[PDB]
Every structure is written in structure tokens, then in C-alpha cells.
Amino acid sequence: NKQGEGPVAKGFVQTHSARNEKPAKDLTESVLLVGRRAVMWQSLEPAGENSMIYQSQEELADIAWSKREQQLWLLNVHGELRSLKFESGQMVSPAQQLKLDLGNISSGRWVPRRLSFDWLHHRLYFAMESPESFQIISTDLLGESAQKVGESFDLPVEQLEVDALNGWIFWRNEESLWRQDLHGRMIHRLLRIRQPGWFLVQPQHFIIHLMLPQEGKFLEISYDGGFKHPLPLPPPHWQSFALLGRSLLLPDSGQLILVEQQGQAASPSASWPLKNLPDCWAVILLVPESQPLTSAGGKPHSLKALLGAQAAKISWKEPERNPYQSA
Numbered sequence: 001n002k003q004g005e006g007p008v009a010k011g012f013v014q015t016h017s018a019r020n021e022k023p024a025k026d027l028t029e030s031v032l033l034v035g036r037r038a039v040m041w042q043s044l045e046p047a048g049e050n051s052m053i054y055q056s057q058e059e060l061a062d063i064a065w066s067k068r069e070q071q072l073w074l075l076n077v078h079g080e081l082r083s084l085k086f087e088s089g090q091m092v093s094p095a096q097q098l099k100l101d102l103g104n105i106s107s108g109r110w111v112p113r114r115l116s117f118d119w120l121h122h123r124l125y126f127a128m129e130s131p132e133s134f135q136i137i138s139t140d141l142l143g144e145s146a147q148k149v150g151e152s153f154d155l156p157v158e159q160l161e162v163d164a165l166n167g168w169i170f171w172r173n174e175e176s177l178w179r180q181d182l183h184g185r186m187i188h189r190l191l192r193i194r195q196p197g198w199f200l201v202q203p204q205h206f207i208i209h210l211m212l213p214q215e216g217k218f219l220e221i222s223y224d225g226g227f228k229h230p231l232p233l234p235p236p237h238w239q240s241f242a243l244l245g246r247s248l249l250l251p252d253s254g255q256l257i258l259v260e261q262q263g264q265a266a267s268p269s270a271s272w273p274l275k276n277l278p279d280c281w282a283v284i285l286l287v288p289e290s291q292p293l294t295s296a297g298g299k300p301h302s303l304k305a306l307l308g309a310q311a312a313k314i315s316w317k318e319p320e321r322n323p324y325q326s327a
């Protein structure tokens with residue numbers, strides 16, 4: 001306060017352990033880089049395959065990727081949804097058209113553009129476009145159990161993602177990024193930047209990592225939205241990205257740049273050819289850490305035990321939710 005200083009509150013805390021660094025000789029991850037017309041699967045070995053997964057002549061509006069089923073749903077610019085299941089980077093099943101009911105919620109016409117996947121409830125989230133407003137509305141994989149969350153807004157979201165484990169849906173406009181839960185109870189706006197680009201969500205890190213192609217610098221956005229932090233970036237404007245540990249994937253139009261966010265982009269650690277792709281609006285990493293079922297923190301407390309002659313009623317408290325987690 002103005003007059004003085006209060007007492008000192010002490011706390012003991014340990015941060016998490018260092019992630020193991022895989023070199024250029026021993027990189028074994030797999031990626032899907034997704035274009036508007038050319039969707040391609042690549043393996044990050046020194047001897048890696050540069051193979052086509054799927055080619056669509058129509059422009060694809062948004063994608064959604066599942067880990068447990070390996071399915072890339074496809075939504076075009078018209079609004080007809082094609083469900084396409086793959087297996088390990090190639091065709092096992094073709095595209096199936098999935099029809100969606102409007103119901104009594106969608107009173108007027110609305111067309112789809114957006115795709116996102118919850119892996120805990122197996123529940124799809126899409127926002128709509130009105131031919132006069134942009135309104136988020138949730139349904140099942142089959143599609144009949146449709147009900148809407150939130151309120152319509154005029155600003156177009158360009159990218160929708162799900163952090164299922166912490167219970168959040170992020171929609172990001174050209175005006176702001178927003179944070180909202182799965183049941184429609186609480187709605188929060190995070191940060192105000194004119195035209196942000198692509199964001200990637202890590203659920204264990206609790207950090208939204210975002211690249212502006214207009215600014216061309218790092219930006220860190222937290223889940224409450226009040227924390228903003230830059231880092232030094234290698235210079236080239238990449239439309240999307242993926243993060244693999246301490247290494248950063250930056251796709252050029254002919255190669256891929258492997259940097260550890262301090263070395264230059266002119267000398268990558270390893271390069272993989274991307275010559276069939278025109279541009280990279282969506283870089284998707286195939287790790288099991290991209291969709292964890294593990295919340296990665298747990299210790300019970302307040303153990304109460306009420307006993308008897310030959311029995312006991314024993315009650316404990318669940319570990320509490322964090323503010324970066326949801327209800």
C-alpha cells in the first residue's frame with residue numbers, strides 16, 4: 001500500500017522436468033501438412049517418405065483430426081461435410097457425406113465452414129455463416145443431437161480448436177481470440193490484436209502458442225488472457241506451424257525448416273521436401289501428447305475416516321480444479 005509493505009507469504013513449488021531432445025538423426029515423428037487442394041502426410045526421418053494422402057480439387061474450409069480413430073473430416077467452401085477415415089497416412093476408407101439437421105434452433109439458413117474435435121465426449125463443434133452472423137453450435141458424430149452455445153457475432157473466426165482435457169473451446173476472430181467452455185456457461189475474451197494468425201493448443205503446457213504472419217514474431221497467450229510474452233524468432237511469412245518439443249516446424253514452399261527458436265532459418269538442422277504443396281494453412285503433428293487423456297497432476301487431500309466394530313466409512317476430497325482448467 002502507500003504507507004508500507006505487508007508480510008511475506010512463502011510457498012514451495014517445483015516445475016516439470018525437461019523434455020528429451022531428439023536430434024536430426026533420430027527424429028521419428030510424423031506430420032500431416034494440409035493444403036486447400038493437397039493434403040499430404042510426411043515422416044520426419046532422415047530417410048522419410050514424401051507421400052500423398054488425399055487430393056481434393058474443391059477448396060477445403062476447415063479440418064479436424066482424431067487420434068483414436070485416425071479420421072480427417074473435410075468441409076468445403078459450400079458447406080457440405082465429407083467424413084474421411086484414414087489409417088497411418090494412407091487410404092483405408094473414402095469420403096462419406098455426413099448430413100446435418102437444422103432443427104428448431106437454426107430458424108433461418110446457416111451454412112457450415114468450421115471443424116473441431118472433442119475427444120472426451122466425441123462431440124463435434126461447428127460455427128455457421130448466415131446469408132444476411134457467426135454462431136457456434138454443438139452436435140454428436142452422428143449429427144442429430146444438435147444444440148447451440150453462446151450468441152451470434154458478425155466477426156469471422158478463421159480457426160476453431162478444442163482443448164478437451166481442460167474443457168475449453170477457443171474461437172479466434174480477426175478481432176480477438178475467445179475462450180469458452182463445453183456447456184455454454186462461461187464466456188471470456190482473451191486478447192485484442194488486429195488480424196492474428198494460426199494458434200496451437202498444448203493442454204499440459206497451458207500455453208496458447210500463436211504466430212502472426214503480419215507481425216512475424218512470437219506471441220504467448222495464456223488461458224486467462226492476461227499474460228503476453230514474446231520470444232526471438234528466426235526470420236524468413238508462414239501461415240501455420242507445429243511445435244515439437246524445443247524444436248519449431250516452419251514450412252517453406254519447397255522444404256521444411258527445423259529450428260530450435262535461436263538458430264537461423266537459413267541453416268536448418270534437417271530438411272524434408274514439400275514441393276507439391278502450394279502453401280501451408282494447417283500443419284498437424286501426430287503425437288499422442290497432442291491429445292492427452294492424462295491431466296498430469298494429482299494428489300488427494302483431507303482424508304476423513306469414520307470407523308466401527310467391523311467396518312469403516314472413509315471419505316476423501318478430490319483434487320481441485322485449476323483456473324486454467326474448467327468445470
Ligand SMILES: *[C@@H]1O[C@H](CO)[C@@H](O)[C@H](O)[C@H]1NC(C)=O
Binds near residue numbers: 012013014
Ligand atoms: C521443494 O523443496 C522442498 C524442500 O525440500 C520440499 O519440501 C518440496 O516438496 C519441494 N516442492 C515440490 C513441489 O516438490
